[PDB]
Design a binder for this molecule. Structure first.
Ligand SMILES: [Cl-]
Ligand SMILES: [Cl-]
Ligand SMILES: [Cl-]
Ligand SMILES: [Cl-]
Ligand SMILES: [Cl-]
Ligand SMILES: [Cl-]
Ligand SMILES: [Cl-]
Ligand SMILES: [Cl-]
Ligand SMILES: [Cl-]
Ligand SMILES: [Cl-]
Ligand SMILES: [Hg+2]
Ligand SMILES: [Hg+2]
Ligand SMILES: [Hg+2]
Ligand SMILES: [Hg+2]
Ligand SMILES: [Hg+2]
Ligand SMILES: [Hg+2]
Ligand SMILES: [Hg+2]
Lengths: 71, 401, 71, 431
């Protein structure tokens, strides 16, 4: 469960890394600039929805909307 | 008045024709809450009100035969009040493309040669098309045998008859072999790893095409209808979406990278085979639970190569329906134009090369494998025209890949 | 359930708005942004920032998660 | 060398002081895979490499008492190799604020009850040249508490107080009285900081703010505040004492303690409120956090710095505000050494006319509303805050006074009540 652009970018960065991709491997895969992947990782608030979803497709993820750990 | 809209015996909502003829639509609240829930069209998002947009009329207009002449026959035969969608659909609105069924608020080798039994254009536009309703007929068949359904019960096949000859003001297109033509083109497309439906020629000599919006029950007991719509419906339309709009859209597909690759690939295929009918109307998506979507197989593919020359037309007359780059003339178009387009679209250059390269490599054996698997019956002029004009444009790939 | 574009997301969230029959301004007022902004989102979702998206999403009392019926 | 970082016997990664003496951190692949996974701090997001930013040093540095004097004691208490975080934490990093347990790499009782008599308790509480009540005749009592007050943490189930051993968690923070602050420019009567916090906690709670329970404890001549930890909790089967992941705003923002003050300057209202939009209770949290700004103006709390607020970190790295804590009125200092309410400043300034308003005497409903609007906090909600205080404050004060133990110092109650009641008059004037 995710509630800010920052928490979103972090989880997506870690999926990028778990995958062994680089910010360039990723930007190449969907055809945008390295600088846009890195703008999103570092300051996501201003990232548009359309860019986010391009990043998400290339990470092989979708998203869902929402409304058992001890701690 | 109202038509209740069903999808597979599940209730979706209602279409109203108001007093001034305006069409409006409202989702059932037990639809918006089923696990099946999706929009009827991506142009008609799940929502609560009465929907009054042009999208509603267009949606339902897009379900009916395009031809104003096939429209008269339905009008004459079923005593329809008009050619408005509501009126024509309160008469034939049972089986349609994809899944929607609309309900008022309330066989034999020789009868076959018989069942299929029914042109001039004002416009100089070289329409070479297998998408016309005027040659089609949805039959049903799992046996060895054709048969007309009837009731609420889906068809499995679309049967296409030859188009025949077509006269516009400035040319006569001989499309009397459009059945053999589409057959060839569909095997070619399969050979090149494009997804397209299975077809057979049946015998009158017609195309039997297996529907990809029909699927049997797990229990194998009831033919289901798969929701799908064309790009006109998707965009709310009766201009016309090109490669850019469609490619943008396909970024939201649940198979975005595959569908985007295939779709670009298919622009190269249509260039190679001389196909000039790839309008928006002619690509479709499956609508899935939630209103996510995927491209269907490609369908209704015909080469214009067999109408070149003689009583027919020139190669300089062949235009792609969706242009590149702006560039539409098939005989002026080189690998370089596809790459300029991929670049403008932020489709990866490397994926474009890959596509161009595999056609370079694969075209000759595909053409040869198709040729091997044709019936003995097959008209050689058809093969010769397609094959020779394919190898010619393909040599533009060799000069390069 | 799985979502793949800005438009699909906008649509699903518009519907959630409606099912709680809230109105665009009830919402905007709940979080402190002008009702246009919500309207601009439901109608033109592509260029909405992630910051704005997570505001509207808080208004509707939703979060989002990342993911990997016979018809 | 390395400290292994654990959270409730889940392994999280390692803190490494490098040969050149720089602090870096690296999460364990098992942590990153785990259902329990979440960042150690929001300043240290989950990732694969080594983190080597300042945020790492600051995180751990913020686990420790801020004073160099206290630190110097721990150093002597345990012959600690030094006074740097890494070295202090290798001695006392088993029990800290939130859930971090630090275990030297080469190298414990899980719940080790170990009773205090009372003369012993008086001796633990009296222990200041000893750090954090960590007696010299006692190993396996290895606790850290941030902040500047002399304090300690104890464990308690039922009725008796114990020194916890090994990696056993504490259940209470025990505060001792501050006394006379002589500032170059003033001399303050905080001899009574235990009664004063006791009182303000009671009143916060009376006004429906979320705050810990506290009790006054006496151990011979020692009078102490025992505050119940909200970063500790019984599991379902009340069989394990869990630590809850938690950090302060200084940690969340990657900053030292020692900028803490909006003066020097640390995070204020706007930064904090913007962060809270990201909370898993954004609207509740932003409401209560604004509410508590009016509260602190009302009680003359001049020390609500960024270090005084904390968020729980939940699975996945979402977060929301902990209860508020460390609440002290400056009202009991006024009068006898020449300080009056005209001298009292808020730690975090409001929006004013032009610039920020920090003077408590000069602040009126009008500044709160101008601040709400800068911040895009709903006007109807800020009226609703200013008006509930208008209506409730005089009765809340009386309720609180009535619940006070018979021996409670009158000078604290009066100083706080009369000054509250009078700032309240700015509200009921309008509400
Ligand atoms: Cl990396
Ligand atoms: Cl959920
Ligand atoms: Cl276009
Ligand atoms: Cl050119
Ligand atoms: Cl051209
Ligand atoms: Cl509405
Ligand atoms: Cl999932
Ligand atoms: Cl600030
Ligand atoms: Cl002023
Ligand atoms: Cl001031
Ligand atoms: Hg969910
Ligand atoms: Hg049949
Ligand atoms: Hg039959
Ligand atoms: Hg169209
Ligand atoms: Hg999911
Ligand atoms: Hg105990
Ligand atoms: Hg700080």
């Amino acid at each position: 469960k995710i509630y800010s652009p920052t928490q979103l970018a972090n989880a997506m960065k870690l999926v990028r890394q778990q995958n062994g991709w680089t910010q360039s491997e990723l930007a190449k895969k969907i055809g945008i600039k390295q600088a846009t992947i890195s703008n999103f990782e570092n300051n996501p608030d201003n990232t548009t929805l359309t860019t986010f979803f391009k990043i998400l497709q290339s990470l092989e993820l979708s998203m869902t909307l929402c409304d058992n750990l001890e701690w | 008045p109202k038509l209740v809209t069903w999808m597979n015996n599940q209730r979706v909502g209602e279409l109203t024709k108001l007093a001034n003829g305006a069409h409006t639509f409202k989702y059932a609240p037990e639809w918006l809450a089923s696990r099946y829930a999706r929009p009827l069209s991506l142009s008609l998002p799940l929502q609560r009100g009465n929907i009054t947009s042009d999208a509603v009329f267009n949606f339902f207009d897009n379900l009916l035969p395009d031809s104003p002449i096939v429209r008269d026959r339905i009008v004459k035969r079923y005593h329809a009040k008009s050619r408005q969608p509501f009126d024509l659909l309160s008469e034939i609105g049972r089986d349609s493309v994809g899944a929607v069924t609309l309900i008022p608020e309330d066989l034999t080798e020789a009868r076959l040669e018989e069942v299929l039994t029914a042109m001039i254009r004002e416009e100089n536009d070289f329409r070479i098309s297998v998408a016309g309703a005027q040659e089609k007929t949805a039959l049903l068949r799992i046996g060895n045998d054709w048969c007309i359904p009837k009731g609420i019960t889906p068809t499995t096949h679309i049967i296409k008859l030859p188009i025949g000859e077509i006269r516009q003001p400035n040319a006569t297109l001989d499309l009397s072999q459009s059945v053999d033509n589409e057959y060839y083109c569909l095997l070619l497309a399969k050979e090149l790893g494009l997804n397209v439906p299975d077809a057979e020629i049946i015998k009158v000599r017609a195309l039997a095409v297996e529907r990809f919006d029909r699927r049997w029950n797990a229990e194998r007991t009831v033919l289901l209808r798969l929701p799908q719509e064309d790009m006109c419906q998707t965009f709310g339309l009766p201009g016309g979406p090109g490669i850019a709009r469609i490619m943008a859209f396909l970024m939201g597909s649940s198979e975005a990278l595959k569908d985007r690759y295939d779709f670009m690939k298919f622009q190269v295929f249509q260039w190679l085979i001389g196909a000039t009918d790839g309008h928006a109307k002619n690509f479709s998506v499956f609508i899935q639970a939630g209103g996510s979507y995927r491209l269907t197989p490609f369908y209704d593919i015909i080469s214009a190569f067999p109408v070149l020359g003689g009583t027919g037309i020139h190669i300089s007359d062949l235009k792609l329906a969706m242009g590149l780059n702006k560039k539409t003339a098939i005989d002026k178009i080189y690998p370089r134009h596809f790459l300029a387009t991929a670049k403008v679209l932020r489709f990866p250059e490397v994926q474009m090369h890959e596509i161009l390269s595999d056609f370079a490599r694969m075209i000759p054996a595909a053409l040869d494998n198709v040729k091997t698997s044709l019936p003995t019956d097959f008209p050689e002029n058809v093969v010769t025209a397609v094959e020779s004009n394919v190898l010619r444009l393909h040599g533009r790939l060799s000069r390069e890949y």
